[PDB]
Amino acid sequence: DGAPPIMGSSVYITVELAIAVLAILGNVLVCWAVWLNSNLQNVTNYFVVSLAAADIAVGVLAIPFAITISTGFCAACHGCLFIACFVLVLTQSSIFSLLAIAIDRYIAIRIPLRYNGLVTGTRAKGIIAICWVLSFAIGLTPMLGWNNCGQPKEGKNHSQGCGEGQVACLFEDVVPMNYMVYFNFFACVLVPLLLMLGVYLRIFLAARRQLADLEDNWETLNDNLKVIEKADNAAQVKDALTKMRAAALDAQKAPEMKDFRHGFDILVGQIDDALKLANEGKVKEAQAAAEQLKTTRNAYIQKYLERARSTLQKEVHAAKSLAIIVGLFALCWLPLHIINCFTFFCPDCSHAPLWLMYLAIVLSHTNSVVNPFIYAYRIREFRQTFRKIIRSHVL
Ligand SMILES: CC(C)CCC[C@@H](C)[C@H]1CC[C@H]2[C@@H]3CC=C4C[C@@H](O)CC[C@]4(C)[C@H]3CC[C@]12C
Ligand SMILES: CC(C)CCC[C@@H](C)[C@H]1CC[C@H]2[C@@H]3CC=C4C[C@@H](O)CC[C@]4(C)[C@H]3CC[C@]12C
Ligand SMILES: CC(C)CCC[C@@H](C)[C@H]1CC[C@H]2[C@@H]3CC=C4C[C@@H](O)CC[C@]4(C)[C@H]3CC[C@]12C
Ligand SMILES: Nc1nc(NCCc2ccc(O)cc2)nc2nc(-c3ccco3)nn12
Ligand SMILES: CCCCCCCC/C=C\CCCCCCCC(=O)O
Ligand code: NA
């Protein structure tokens, strides 16, 4: 007896098809938006588009393949392997795109002046092509001989009635678990995820150190103004102006930049005017001259400190958005990997039940639906472009 298998299969297939439709629709929308809007055509979003292409291919190809292999149909073993492993190509391509995005944002916050000369569209396109080639080689490695085709399940193959040279096409009968655990999970998934975690950690540390340095230079300017006003001797005035001058040149280092220089030029020239007074022992004139710095601070320096701060806060917010993507990739794929570790490392354990295997498979596929929602909720330029596309070409 036992419940007819087609009842549970019907539920699984219906859910897979629902996921495939949403993965295609949302990720086509991502690609459309980048095509339409020049503000979205930058190197970072070339990797976003490559990631969306991989998720479109989950809906078009990997989900029909997953449905097919759930039936255990008879197949030539290398044809079976291709249908079993193709999803691993798409998932490896996703990992490479996620890693490139993290490195791109790290270069941008670490050496922003070098960024545009280093990271070009032409170089990004070459990197994307190479990553797709490597993804095929990695995900299809079982087809090169690391497979169980040489040790068929003869009982399964006779009970299904397969012909000569065919196997019953079931994932765990043809793909070796040592490949899935040691090669795919540990080396190809978990090591890159840990690398991505460390890169994001370095991004947030760099932003936090730059904001701290901004504030230090700002407090150094103001505190030394108070010292000069509180002073009663040329050397104390002289000392405070010298410290004020270094903070000013440090801040200057940390079209639009023409007004920026004029502000700091008035500032540094005023410090030098006051210093020259100080070296001659004119303390009250040095204090008077040093009081002019306050209108320069209010007219130029505070305004540029604010823009620097808000630019850094935007980069932090944008890096947090992109890291949520990495975290949802991990949440959707880790259950399947962890089940494989139990299967492989605990021969004394009963195998995870079939309903749980298929739930983990469906969860991994749902990852191909979620990124368009994160872009819509977290990134204004995507949200506004989505809204324009839907209102114009669907309404
Ligand atoms: C969408 C288009 C462009 C690409 C799709 C190509 C797919 C559908 C083709 C390419 C290779 C094909 C497989 C190659 C060999 C076999 C072994 C045979 O015993 C069963 C069919 C099977 C498993 C084929 C199924 C269909 C297949 C997966
Ligand atoms: C990243 C987070 C969400 C991972 C979620 C943890 C999941 C994948 C873990 C938690 C408890 C685990 C199960 C607990 C014990 C068993 C019984 C054993 O005979 C087969 C594996 C099986 C069935 C485990 C499968 C994996 C499992 C379900
Ligand atoms: C979450 C990331 C960062 C680390 C990944 C944790 C993985 C590798 C850990 C978490 C829980 C672990 C499992 C917990 C218990 C068992 C049963 C034991 O008889 C064999 C090892 C096995 C099956 C472990 C394998 C490794 C394991 C799956
Ligand atoms: N273990 C596993 N099984 C399957 N499908 C087979 C589910 C199953 C397992 C046992 C059985 O007797 C009948 C069916 N797909 C799978 N995909 C993956 C995978 C992809 C990426 C990481 O793990 N692991 N994986
Ligand atoms: C964007 C461009 C993507 C094109 C990449 C294609 C390159 C494929 C490279 C290596 C794939 C190796 C898989 C081996 C095929 C086995 C065939 C067989 O033995 O039947
Ligand atoms: Na993906």
From Swiss-Prot:
This is Adenosine receptor A2a. Glycans are attached at residue 157. Interacts (via cytoplasmic C-terminal domain) with USP4; the interaction is direct. May interact with DRD4. Interacts with NECAB2. Interacts (via cytoplasmic C-terminal domain) with GAS2L2; interaction enhances receptor-mediated adenylyl cyclase activity. Ubiquitinated. Deubiquitinated by USP4; leading to stabilization and expression at the cell surface. Disulfide bonds join 74-162, 77-149, 80-169, 346-349. One of its GO terms (molecular function) is lipid binding. It is a multi-pass membrane protein. Belongs to the G-protein coupled receptor 1 family. Residues 36-45, 104-123, 202-321 are cytoplasmic. It comes from the Eukaryota. The keyword Ribonucleoprotein does not apply. Receptor for adenosine. The activity of this receptor is mediated by G proteins which activate adenylyl cyclase. The gene is ADORA2A. Residues 5-10, 70-80, 147-176, 346-353 are extracellular. GO terms for cellular component: asymmetric synapse; axolemma; dendrite; glutamatergic synapse; intermediate filament; membrane; neuronal cell body; plasma membrane. Keywords: Cell membrane, Disulfide bond, G-protein coupled receptor, Glycoprotein, Membrane, Receptor, Transducer, Transmembrane, Transmembrane helix, Ubl conjugation. The chain crosses the membrane at residues 11-35, 46-69, 81-103, 124-146, 177-201, 322-345, 354-377. It is found in: Cell membrane. GO terms for biological process: adenylate cyclase-activating G protein-coupled receptor signaling pathway; adenylate cyclase-modulating G protein-coupled receptor signaling pathway; apoptotic process; apoptotic signaling pathway; astrocyte activation; blood circulation; blood coagulation; cell-cell signaling. The chain holds residues 2 to 308 of 412 of the full protein. Adenosine binds at residues 172, 340, 364-365. The cytoplasmic C-terminal domain is necessary for targeting the non-ubiquitinated form of this protein to the cell surface.
